[PDB]
């Protein structure tokens, strides 16, 4: 009954928007934090006892 | 007119049409990526002075810590791969594994089941028929590398037709002393010691002077599809250890002295493209056995 | 690909009970079930693949008229989720459930000269896994214990090794020893490992791993039930119950 | 008398009697428009130097993302299609396709499963029987264009008896030299160049005169219901791809050169209104093949 | 003996050594995709009563804008084209294009101008040779559709022998009368309509019996890789265009019928395969010719 | 790399002034020429692929000891990239500017027998494209006006009218004619960006693609690896 207009006419420059595309490239930074942490603490520790 | 074949292309049984689907191989792919950690856990123990890197990896294998009361056996990982590997040699061998169990087994390690990324190249040499003339002997011995010795006491030269099949690609010919070689409506060349061959051509004419016997001795190159993981030295290996511990014991099959030969015959017989996807799958089971096995003897 | 799906012995039996014959019988043509034929596989070979067609695939075949061919569509239908092409059977026959016709005498179905070595040779229980032999030997007591032919039964289990260690352990008239059994009988289901979009090479295989990717969708469809969210929707003569009996059992 | 027919008409084998109801047709339509679809897109990649659209086309027709080091076949449809395919042509030819498949394939894209909406012109020339008398020699060669050639030794004029069949629309024939032609009981016209032909007419009389051989050439136009989708070119080129892969390497199976001549020759047999039905979805499933193979390819 | 040949198949002239680059093949692949916009162009101001869509196209294609008073001929993108398709066809044409020309003329669009993507099929039938006995007569006419006509003169059954080469990949056989037909060492089958060869094979033998004349018909489909663009009715059209405004017309060099003769010829040439890539580029650019010309008629 | 950057004839005279025989010169034995070969383009075809090798590939080839063979030395440095393998030509000639063999008497050689339209057909004028049959064109004016044989120069572009089309617009010894010279010359330039790193069929056509590539990397790093030797010489 009461439905919003949404309007993104102020986030597109032409066909590229800018503020979801550098959202997207952070991952590809955790990628690198994930794998260099994985592998730190592997070489630190080594296999685990309880 | 005599016929001789090879021995080991006679008769090949039929091969099991269970444990070929995709939960399957990747049950198989998890088992030889875990072995060869099993292995490599070892030469980190003598590294460390400790043995928990082989606990972590026994533990991974088979489910369960290892105990120094009991001999290590691989748990449920290695009843699984003991039994798929039976079932593979023969159709009459149950397939008493389910296939919830496999579906758990397979889901330990990340691996794509896909046998067909990579080739090798197998070395048993396919002589299907040698037809010689009467008056003639024809001796054919060996797989690897075929000796075939022809002698004979008629009164002029013989003509002897040679069948190497329709799989093998390259077929290279050896003799003793120099002969002369050609397809089947072909000139024949001069006396020659090497000849290199498709057996895809045709039947080959080899003419036999009165004398002393020649010998001619064949060695064959065939490249079949397998996966990456493929190792040829421990997937022959695991073959020896299968048949010494009794997992090829089945009523009416026939046994091979390599894996070589066993790929070879089946590929050979009818409707043989069939048989080769699962010689494959348990060649890579088998490497996974010879891994296992050499860490946990029982 | 619901008959597929049961995963223990009382949802297979009470699919059976809601389940009519017609669902088993197919109305396609299909070919003849025995026979050498090349198929292409272009994934994997340029050349054609050699395989042999069988009753267990999924796809239909054309079947005998006699009641060897009805019992053989049943079986078909429990373990490949196809049945054959056996026309004409008659409204009386093909409006009773699966159960019935397994379990009862009333439907007028003579079952007792049936030879379970020949069913099992003609329907290739070398080919068949370890669900799909479970399945057939569910069958198989069920009408064994119709005929009271209960002997006869285990006197082919014995001959047979691997089925005796597979053999079902339930009394076909008592629901307590139904709802104990523990046994496995999925064929597809919510898959552990990595299942992709590619194809098999053998007829079964690749049949089945249609019905696999077949029922992934059928879970996150709309026409799949979901217990969890939805009980209170479901009708009260279908609902789950935890003391839901077969009748007569 | 001597009896000469066409070779391509002679002994047409039974086709398929599977994948020939709503679901199935469905699924054929659904397969040459996502064809279309993955030629349009490769040609798009090209201009535009990027792989988004062709990636995008065959995620569609394979419900798999391309990945390297993978050879694209097209997934789960290029193998339904196939088999399929294989079993239209031949009786002999197994039914390996489960009906879950077919259901499946046949929701991706909404399309009318209709073979019947438009028509089509084929040009294979019937020649079911050329009577002739015992002096007089008569050969026929040709599908298309059909060439027959008498001579007469005998010592007087002869009459040779064509028959064209019932199918053919129109029949045009030509001779190297004027003739005369007129159906049975009568009398018969001048000599002319052409003749315009109904094949219902009936037998049709030839007057072969003594002395050098007279050939006549032979064009024939029917039509057959297809549906609007229906592109002869297309047709023609699955069918010899499909010959060339093997697909229709079945046993006791006949071979034609053109799908032209395939599809006359089954009209011409018994049966041949439900038989023609069978074909029409075949040429749309070459069709969608002769796309798919195009779009891609194997060295 | 006697022997007997396709016509088309005789002396295939060389073809041309140059525009065959990278930079070349794009420039080809950029004039038949500007050819074709300019063709739906000129249909999309007849509909929409405006020379403005025509303008745009021309101007893309020649570099100027259209004149009343000036013959509209396509500017130098059209004398590059024309001047490339005469180097192709032999190797004494001049080839005198710049390659600054030819590379500025790439840049108009962006294409791959790879000439693998696709394949196309060539109905061609090549009888590489027909060997016949004594008393025996026989004619071959046609190329799209090969007769083969043969007379036994002789006392008894004649066998005649077929080689269709080994570049074709199927053959189909017709005959006016069933006829055996059998490869070399093979028994004969009963006889029959149709048959159906694979011209790799070797050579096939045809009974002739006596009396009336056996007369066959050749249909063969061949496979050659060609980029997506290639059309073959357009191809046909621009090659007898080419004909007709003789730019075929050099020194030493043979002439067909059809493109489909054309490429079929220089690929049984003695290393035919090396021309096999030129003579698709050819096609392309008559492709680009056909279009423009009938847009823009000189 | 350097010789086939040039684009006019006035930057290919200038380098031919700096540039020694040496360079025009191989100390690889190479293999013999006119050879029909079977090489393997794994890229388009999975059988062999037959080619012909020739003196204006690429690649360096054994060379004959006549003044012939160093004529035909420099020509395809100039048109190919690389020379052929002529042994023990003499330490004084060597040194000598390329322009000083082709247009000075003061080296000692003699050049007046040579026969223009042989020399052509060993170069296998046929297979090159318009660029390396005007760099060939423009190495004949230089040795035929040496000479005194501007005649024959020109009687022999009559026979050959394909060659007469692309003739150098420049008369030796004139300087004004160098100056106002419109020639392009350059086989190897900064690629347009289409260019991809892909193999070609021909022998001559991927080794002339492979100069193409390496040019980009070649323009620059050339000047610090040539200084880093060049100094305290």
């Not at chain 3, 050498?36 to 075949?61: A, C, F, H, M």
């Not at chain 3, 014995?158 to 008239?173: T, W």
Request: glycine share 6%.
């Amino acid at each position: 009954f009461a439905l919003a207009q949404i309007n993104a006419d102020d986030e597109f420059i032409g066909a590229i928007d800018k503020e979801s595309a550098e959202y997207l490239d952070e991952y590809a930074t955790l990628a690198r934090d994930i794998s260099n942490s994985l592998t730190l603490v592997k070489a630190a520790f080594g296999p685990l006892e309880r | 007119a005599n016929r001789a074949t090879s021995a080991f292309l006679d008769n090949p049984h039929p091969v099991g049409v269970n444990y070929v689907d995709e939960g399957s191989r990747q049950f198989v792919a998890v088992a030889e990526l875990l072995a060869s950690k099993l292995i490599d856990s070892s030469r980190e123990s003598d590294e460390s002075n400790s043995d928990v890197p082989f606990v972590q990896a026994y533990s991974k294998f088979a489910d369960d810590n290892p105990r120094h009361l009991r001999v290590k056996t691989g748990g449920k990982m290695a009843n699984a791969l003991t039994n798929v590997i039976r079932s593979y040699y023969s159709i009459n061998a149950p397939a008493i594994v389910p296939q919830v169990e496999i579906d758990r087994l397979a889901s330990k390690a990340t691996v794509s089941g896909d046998m067909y990324n990579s080739y090798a190249i197998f070395n048993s040499v396919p002589i299907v028929e040698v037809l010689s003339p009467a008056r003639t002997t024809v001796s054919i011995v060996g797989s690897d590398r075929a000796d075939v010795t022809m002698l004979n006491t008629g009164a002029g030269a013989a003509n002897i037709t040679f069948n190497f099949g329709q799989i093998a690609e390259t077929v290279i010919l050896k003799g003793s002393v120099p002969f002369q070689l050609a397809r089947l409506n072909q000139p024949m060349p001069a006396a020659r010691f090497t000849y290199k061959l498709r057996p895809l051509d045709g039947p080959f004419i080899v003419v036999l002077p009165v004398g002393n016997p020649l010998v001619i001795s064949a060695t064959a190159a065939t490249r079949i599809q397998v996966p990456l993981a493929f190792n040829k030295a421990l997937v022959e290996s695991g073959f020896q250890t299968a048949m010494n511990d009794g997992l090829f014991d089945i009523q009416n099959v026939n046994y091979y002295s390599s894996f070589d030969e066993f790929i070879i015959s089946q590929y050979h017989a009818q409707d043989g493209i069939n048989r080769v996807s699962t010689c494959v799958i348990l060649g890579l089971a088998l490497q996974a056995y010879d891994q296992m096995r050499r860490a946990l003897p029982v | 690909m619901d008959v597929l799906s049961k995963g223990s012995l009382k949802e297979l039996l009470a699919h059976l009970e809601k389940t009519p014959l017609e669902e088993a019988i197919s109305y396609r043509i299909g070919t003849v079930p025995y026979q050498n034929v090349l198929i292409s596989r272009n994934e994997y070979y340029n050349q054609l693949y050699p395989d042999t067609t069988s009753l267990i695939d999924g796809v239909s075949r054309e079947g005998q008229r006699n009641v060897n061919g009805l019992i053989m569509s049943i079986i078909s239908y429990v373990v490949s989720g196809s049945g054959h092409y056996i026309p004409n059977i008659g409204f009386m026959l093909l409006r009773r459930s699966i159960l019935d016709i397994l379990t009862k005498h009333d439907t007028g179905l003579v079952t007792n000269n049936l030879n379970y070595g020949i069913i099992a040779r003609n329907l290739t229980v070398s080919k068949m896994n370890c669900e799909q032999r479970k399945r057939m030997l569910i069958c198989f007591k069920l009408l064994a214990y119709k005929d009271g032919n209960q002997n006869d039964y285990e006197i082919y289990l014995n001959q047979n090794i691997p089925l005796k260690q597979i053999a079902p352990n339930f009394i076909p008239g008592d629901m307590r020893t139904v709802i104990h059994n523990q046994d496995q009988l999925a064929i597809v289901g919510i898959p552990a490992y990595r299942l992709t979009q590619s194809t098999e090479l053998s007829i079964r295989d690749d049949n089945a791993k249609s019905y696999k990717l077949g029922y992934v969708d059928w879970y996150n469809s709309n026409s799949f039930l979901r217990e969890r969210s939805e009980f209170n929707l479901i009708r009260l003569k279908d609902r789950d119950t935890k003391y839901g009996k077969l009748n007569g059992w």
